[PDB]
Design a protein around this nucleic acid. Sequence first.
RNA 1: UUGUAUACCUAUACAUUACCGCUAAAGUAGAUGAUUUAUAUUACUUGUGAUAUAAAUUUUGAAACUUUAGUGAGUAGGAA
RNA 2: AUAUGAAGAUCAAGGUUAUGAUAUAAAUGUCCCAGUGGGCCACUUUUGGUAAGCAGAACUGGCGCUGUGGGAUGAACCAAA
RNA 3: CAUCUAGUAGCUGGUUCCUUCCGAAGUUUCCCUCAGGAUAGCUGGUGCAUAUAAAUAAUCUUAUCUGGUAAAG
RNA 4: UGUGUUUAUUAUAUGCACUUGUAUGAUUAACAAUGCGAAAGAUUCAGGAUACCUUCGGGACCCGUCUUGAAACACGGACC
Lengths: 158, 226, 75, 173, 187
Amino acid sequence: TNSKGYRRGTRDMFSRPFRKHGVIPLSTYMRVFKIGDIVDIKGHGAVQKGLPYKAYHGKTGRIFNVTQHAVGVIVNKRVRGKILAKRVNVRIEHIHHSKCREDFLRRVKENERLLKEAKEKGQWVSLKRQPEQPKKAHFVKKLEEPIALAPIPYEFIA
Amino acid sequence: KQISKRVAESKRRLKKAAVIALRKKENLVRAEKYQNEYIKAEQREIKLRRLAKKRNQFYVPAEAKLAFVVRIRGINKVAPKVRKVLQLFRLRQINNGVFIKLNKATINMLRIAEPYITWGYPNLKSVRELIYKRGFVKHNRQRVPITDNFVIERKLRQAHQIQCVEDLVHEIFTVGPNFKYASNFLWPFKLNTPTGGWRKKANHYVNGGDFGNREDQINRLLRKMV
Amino acid sequence: AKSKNHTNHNQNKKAHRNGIKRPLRKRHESTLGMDVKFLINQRYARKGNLSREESVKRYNERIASQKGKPKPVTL
Amino acid sequence: GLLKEYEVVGRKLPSEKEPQTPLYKMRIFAPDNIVAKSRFWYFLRQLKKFKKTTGEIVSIKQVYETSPVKIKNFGIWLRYDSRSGTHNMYREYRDLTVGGAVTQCYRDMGARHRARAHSIQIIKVDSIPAAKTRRVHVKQFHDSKIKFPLVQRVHHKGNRKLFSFRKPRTYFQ
Amino acid sequence: GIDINHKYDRKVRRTEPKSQDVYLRLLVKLYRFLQRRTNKKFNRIILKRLFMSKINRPPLSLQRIARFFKAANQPESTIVVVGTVTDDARLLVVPKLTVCALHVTQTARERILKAGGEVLTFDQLALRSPTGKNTLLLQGRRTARTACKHFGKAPGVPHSHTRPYVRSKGRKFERARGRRSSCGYKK
RNA sequence: UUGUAUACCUAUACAUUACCGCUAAAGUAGAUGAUUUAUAUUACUUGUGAUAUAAAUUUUGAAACUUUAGUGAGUAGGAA
RNA sequence: AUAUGAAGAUCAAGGUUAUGAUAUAAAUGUCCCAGUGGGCCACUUUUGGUAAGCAGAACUGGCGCUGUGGGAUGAACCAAA
RNA sequence: CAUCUAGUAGCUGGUUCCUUCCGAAGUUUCCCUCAGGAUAGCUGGUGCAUAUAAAUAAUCUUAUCUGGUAAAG
RNA sequence: UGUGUUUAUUAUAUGCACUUGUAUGAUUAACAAUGCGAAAGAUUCAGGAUACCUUCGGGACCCGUCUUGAAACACGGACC
């Protein structure tokens, strides 16, 4: 009967990776964080100041604040069963940029590049994503060394 | 004023049966175009298979759109991720059938919801017999049988281009661009029970028979249920 | 006599009924616990917008009177 | 059911890095073709990589015994799972069709070795002539001229008369 | 077996007033006819607000009605209040206004009439505007109630400011531990 | 007992239908010569419209009638 | 050293609202409204215990609160509410 | 013996008409608290705001981040 | 798409008067047999757990209660 307290169970959460110990690379402090930016939390065990508490590791929020060393990130925690949006002041070394939306934003960049040159053709602009449709009718040619090439089900004996 | 009411409501009566007689004439020339599409499609696949044998190849025919999906089991003892796929497929009762498009986003819902469901790939005859005999339709949240083409046309002709029954059979069978509307217009097909009944209901079709993809044997089972 | 304490049984049935509830999406989220010197006369970066189009596209040529600030901003 | 044979062919659908994957084929015995396309995948997952979803089923076609009234001995190379137990067998049956001998083997294993059918892999099935069979209960029938007097009939139950007046009499003369 | 019919399957609107006033239910007789036969959402607002309670039909001032009537391009409209219209003594000059209300207060009646404009009932409005043309549909501020300030109290959050239920005013009345940092904490 | 085959029997489940409720939606309120319907004279289009003369139905406990759909387990408990 | 930052406030220009399926009507307040706060069974994973129709937990489904069909019989199993 | 006295009881027992509709809980924290509360959850009632899209909200597909359990060593 | 070559198939061009031919706008409607609701009172046909009795097949434990679980070898209850 514990969780309680504050870095418990984080023997593997705030560990370092293997041979990624030591000095922090310098671009970690050279990243720019503007208000309203999507941001993951993966805490740094080698920076003992401004670590998020363990519920928020692995999560994802939006930057609501910038101060001199940290960003306020607003993160969702399910406190059962309901979702509060938690405001967590977290230092910059524990904070990353989300890649999730900058491969949505390279489609807004193409839902206006492809609708641009569609002023000549007209249609279909085809600006929606399609799931993996079932395949087609297609003519598999053999030739290729005609078949059989015939498996039979056999591997036991030892 | 009533001296103008026979003046107004006798051309509103003459024009009314000029529309209905106009749309009687479209729906014969419309459904003749559709019925010729299906005949050319079938003789194509016969022509293609017979060519690829002579050209010493294979002809892999097209993987299928249009599942017809029946709910075969239970509303008791069901898990929440499989209870939730069966409310998104509108399958809330035993022998409820709906029409489903086969994109990868829904096959992985047909695999989540597998032991409570059978599905397969309908004929044209099975598309017709389910909409002719069993096809009801949704009119301002109410369930309205068919009985004429005005129940289909009054809700799907300004937006979409569906006025007949064979319209609704067209953009469901050949999966057309208004399939989303052609199959949510319907109610779920409240099917009977088979004649001769079932096989096991809790083994796969490929084990010894029932749930999951029967795949062409959904037709034989709809003869019993329709 | 010491019977049966601690279970998360029924606790997600009972928490999914009135559902599991996203907060709600606001166009105006609060500025509180936010950087106060970022805010305190950016209160007056709003209050300095006495006009924004009439007297302001006068300024596009009023500073182009001195040809703008095109060079010396480059440090 | 009755277990007719098929040739299921499969590919590994060719991502553009690889053109024209090598096309393996089979001899699947199955009640129907929906179950022959999960016996193809079960047997090929032992042999090559490409499961489904990452493969294709090229032509599954049924093969129609090439002499349905000629009379021939079928040897079946099998392997099964007993209770302690992966083994091999070589069983011999006497039939006219080749799906009818395989189905005469799926009952016999159920009778004699309790072998519920998900345990049986079939390696090979042949039509061995005679003086290559071994299996003494098949060599009984490899001699013209064979006689055997019959004792076998139907004896309806209850009958066209339940309380009979004239005694069936298993014998006469 | 089918699924699954808790609520609010049965919708919890009103379909009638809870009100045995006969003059009020004669206006429900008009406005069901007026809503059904002119399908204006003006007449459906009047009908649905004619069903409502004493809360949800708050009063409205004579000075808030004179000041919503600085709506531009509207010199000739009618002020519609399904509710009451109270006098304001903080309004020194009453303009020339056309007011339709259930209860217009008595001193609000004379200051409208000495200006002078119209007090109308909702059947003098059904004849003048059966579709609610030339109308300013106004209600009072619902949560101006004192009871609304008491919804609802549980300290910890800097939103709270939500008015405890307490018999008298002064110190000795809920002002020490939890109100005051030198007594326990501040809330 | 093991492996199969057809053919049956069996729920309050499923389908259709009749009836009860509940839910949800929709309609109806010129009575003064108001609305129709069947005939009987005239303007006229061939036909319809209008005046006139020949029988009824309707003052829907507006909390009423009328129309259509779905739906139905229940202790503690709440509510009509 | 920029009244180019960064936030904000405005005018400009942008085909087809940018996977799928669904919509049991969803949203929001108030009575902080009643009862409850002994639970128990099962697959799977588990700890203690030689074991237990024993003790303790995670997960989802059940009985409690529920008839009816099947397992002769039976709280919970199979089917179905 | 009579009164105070119908003393108190987190405990046992009982608690009186029908139909219709909706439908629990055995968990949280805290308490000289462990046969009991208060608390939050679950319930019902009553509304109200929106009916001749591009409003959103919930299981999959896609994109991305997270994880040290099975296996492996 | 285009045009002809062409050979096939559907649709529209059925007005006036009449009639025991569909949705009767959840259709069930016809031919025929039996039997007359006698002035006071019979009879014919169909129906009826009226409170029973007779007969038979299926079902069927004793309620209230606290309880995870009651027919319980848990407690209460002989009857008005």
